[PDB]
Amino acid sequence: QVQLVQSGAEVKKPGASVKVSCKASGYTFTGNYVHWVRQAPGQGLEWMGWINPKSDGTNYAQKFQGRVTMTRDTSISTVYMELSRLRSDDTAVYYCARDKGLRYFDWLSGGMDVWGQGTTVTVSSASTKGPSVFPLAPSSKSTSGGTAALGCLVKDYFPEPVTVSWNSGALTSGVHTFPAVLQSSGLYSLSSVVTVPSSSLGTQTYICNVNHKPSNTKVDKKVEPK
Amino acid sequence: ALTQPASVSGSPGQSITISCTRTAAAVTSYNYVSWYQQHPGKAPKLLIYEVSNRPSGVSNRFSGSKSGNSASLTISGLQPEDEADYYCCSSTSSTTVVFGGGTKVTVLGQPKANPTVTLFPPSSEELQANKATLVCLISDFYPGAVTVAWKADSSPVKAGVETTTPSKQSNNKYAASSYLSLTPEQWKSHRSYSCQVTHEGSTVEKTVAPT
């Protein structure tokens, strides 16, 4: 299975540079062009450029010429995009995406078949702050129709994103992680709630696994009735 | 620069078309067109390549065409899961790529859905940290607009409130959250607090209490 796996999210100060990596697996690296495509919050896709790992050739969008480079390390099947002199409006999710190749020419097509998971880059002078995590216990007040709602509050972090899994990813049914609020303080908070059978509460444990990669911090919290 | 309409809509079972057009204040030889579908919170998915071809596993309800300086995607038999953003993309003779601005597809006719409201009081651990947050989670509503009002006992409280925009859920309904910040003293000094959600002229209100 062809896959692209990117490096983690981070905040960078205005004027700094960011270098995002994209590791390819499941195919021979040199057989396909790889593009970088970014998406600012709530906006559309924007092509940045491509690299051909076989030849080391590249092309870049006019907007970024002189400020971006793309490179590759074949020994570790990895491509990189480095964007310098960062602007606030460089804040975006950066994707790498493989070109499927034209059917009838050994050449790029702009048809991008396999996408990395994205890297959220926030350009801000504000410093990284990891979240505090608190349990949101089930109760008769969060119970209705045979199900109970329980969750985790992920409080006062910066920048986005945070991920939340439940029971190390084994539990996905009835999980709803809500988009974060950007508070007046400039910090984010979010909540993740899992809705489960009320009859399960006496025999099933529930643990939320919170990851804030920008601060390289993960917190697991048990959520039990109080 | 490739222009797409911001929004296109149709009723279930109908066909709709999304355009992708060169602005003509330019001059660039566009060649191979591809189309992408992007659902909220997910990476784009290739639906069409080389103008008209579908990757394996892509529904035959999607078809692609091109004429001169415009290309189009037609979605037939419109289904609820087709609500998403769609992007065209074209390579050029210069080996650059250009995306269109994106189009959001709406499936008309979806019925009103009342919000589910879940209100959590402050956790023991947060109170031990000398803070208190009430968490009001609002889900499964349609159409996607609510307003939120908080009460201490029966009195409105406007300070310390942070409320999100509505967000599109994977089931095509909408979600939002609202947070009320209190001191432990405030939380304990009242008989209860309430989160009142107004949706399409009707309210759902939940109450929690320290006692």
Q: Report CB contact under 8 Å: B126, A189.
A: no
Distance CA B146, CA A189 (A): 20
Element (H, E) at A39: strand A34-39
Question: In chain B, whose CA is at the least distance from the CA of A100?
Answer: B49
Burial class (CB in 10 A: 0-12, 13-18, 19+), A26: exposed
Q: Is the peptide bond prior to B5 cis by the omega test (within 30 degrees of 0)?
A: no
Token pair belonging to B206: 């939940």
Distance CA A64, CA B174 (A): 36
B179 within 8 A of B192, measured Cβ to Cβ: no
Q: Are strands B7-10 and B103-107 parallel, antiparallel or unpaired?
A: parallel
In chain B, positions 72-91, which contact chain A (CB-CB < 8 Å)?
Answer: 85, 87, 89-91
Distance CA A23, CA A25 (A): 7
Considering CB atoms only, which of B45, B99, B175 is closest to A45?
B99
Name the resolution in angstroms.
1.4
Considering the domain architecture, whether residues A75 and A115 belong to the same structural domain is answered as yes
Token pair belonging to A128: 């990284």
In the listed set A62, A90, A125, which residue is the last one of a domain according to the structure?
A125
Considering the domain architecture, whether residues A65 and A147 belong to the same structural domain is answered as no
Q: Does A22 touch chain B (CB under 8 A)?
A: no
Taking residue B157's Cβ as centre, other Cβ atoms within 10 Å add up to 18
Considering the domain architecture, whether residues A95 and A198 belong to the same structural domain is answered as no
Question: In chain A, whose CA is at the least distance from the CA of B126?
Answer: A134
Mutation target vs B (from A181, A196, A208; most B CBs, 10 A cutoff): A181
Q: Report CB contact under 8 Å: A100, B177.
A: no
Query: Please, what's the largest Cα pairwise distance for chain A?
Result: 65
In chain A, positions 93-132, which contact chain B (CB-CB < 8 Å)?
Answer: 95, 97, 100, 102-103, 108-113, 115-118, 132
Considering the domain architecture, whether residues A150 and A183 belong to the same structural domain is answered as yes
Distance from CA of B101 to the nearest CA of A (A): 6
Chain A residues closer than 8 Å to B176 by CB: 178
Contacts (Cβ under 8 Å, ≥6 apart) of B66: B33, B51, B52, B72
Distance CA A188, CA A47 (A): 29
B100 within 8 A of B3, measured Cβ to Cβ: yes
Experimental technique of record? X-ray
Considering the domain architecture, whether residues A88 and A168 belong to the same structural domain is answered as no
A33 within 8 A of A47, measured Cβ to Cβ: no
Domain coordinates of chain B in residue numbers?
1-109, 110-210
Considering CB atoms only, which of A37, A103, A141 is closest to B50?
A103
Considering CB atoms only, which of B100, B120, B129 is closest to A136?
B120
How many CB pairs below 8 Å do chains A and B form together? 139
Strand partners, B136: B119, B178
Q: Are strands A78-83 and A112-115 parallel, antiparallel or unpaired?
A: unpaired
Distance CA A99, CA A29 (A): 12
Considering the domain architecture, whether residues A120 and A207 belong to the same structural domain is answered as no
Distance CA A50, CA B137 (A): 42
Per-residue exposure over A124-155, b if at least 16 CB sit within 10 Å of its own CB, e if not: beeebbbbbbbbbbbeebbbeeebbbbbbbbb
Token pair belonging to A14: 């205005």
Distance CA B143, CA A116 (A): 32
Distance from CA of B205 to the nearest CA of A (A): 13
Residue A74's SS3 state is helix
Q: What is the DSSP letter of A28?
A: -
Distance from CA of B194 to the nearest CA of A (A): 13
3-state SS record for A120-169 = EEEECCCCCECCEEEEECCCHHHEECCEEEEEEEEEEEECCCCEEEEHHH
Contacts (Cβ under 8 Å, ≥6 apart) of B142: B110, B111, B112, B113, B172, B173, B174
Q: How many folded domains does chain A comprise?
A: 2
Contacts (Cβ under 8 Å, ≥6 apart) of A55: none
Say how far residue B81 (Cα) sits from the centre of its chain.
13
Considering the domain architecture, whether residues A67 and A158 belong to the same structural domain is answered as no
Per-residue exposure over A175-211, b if at least 16 CB sit within 10 Å of its own CB, e if not: bbbbbbbebeeebbbbbbbbbbebeebeeeebbbbbb
Distance CA A219, CA B146 (A): 32
In the listed set A125, A150, A178, which residue is the last one of a domain according to the structure?
A125
Distance from CA of B177 to the nearest CA of A (A): 7
Residue A5's SS3 state is strand
Q: Report CB contact under 8 Å: B167, A179.
A: yes
Q: Report CB contact under 8 Å: B163, A181.
A: yes
Question: In chain A, whose CA is at the least distance from the CA of B102?
Answer: A44
Token pair belonging to A94: 């950066």
Residue B129's SS3 state is coil
Distance CA B139, CA B135 (A): 13
Distance CA A193, CA A172 (A): 11
In chain A, the N- to C-terminal Cα span, in Å, equals: 45
Distance CA A50, CA A58 (A): 5
Which residue has tokens 């909220």? B40
Considering the domain architecture, whether residues A41 and A65 belong to the same structural domain is answered as yes
Q: Is the peptide bond prior to A161 cis by the omega test (within 30 degrees of 0)?
A: yes
In chain A, positions 186-215, which contact chain B (CB-CB < 8 Å)?
Answer: 189-191, 193
Q: What is the DSSP letter of A98?
A: E
| Domain of residue A179, residue span | 126-226
Considering the domain architecture, whether residues A51 and A138 belong to the same structural domain is answered as no
Q: What are phi and psi of A207, to 5 degrees?
A: -130, 130
Question: In chain B, whose CA is at the least distance from the CA of A115?
Answer: B43
In the listed set A96, A125, A154, which residue is the last one of a domain according to the structure?
A125
Domain B110-210 falls in which CATH fold? Immunoglobulin-like (2.60.40)
Q: Report CB contact under 8 Å: B137, A193.
A: yes
Considering the domain architecture, whether residues A134 and A221 belong to the same structural domain is answered as yes
Distance CA B2, CA B101 (A): 7
Considering the domain architecture, whether residues A101 and A111 belong to the same structural domain is answered as yes
Residue A214's SS3 state is helix
Considering the domain architecture, whether residues A65 and A173 belong to the same structural domain is answered as no
Chain B residues closer than 8 Å to A155 by CB: 126, 133
Taking residue A78's Cβ as centre, other Cβ atoms within 10 Å add up to 21
Q: Does A172 touch chain B (CB under 8 A)?
A: no
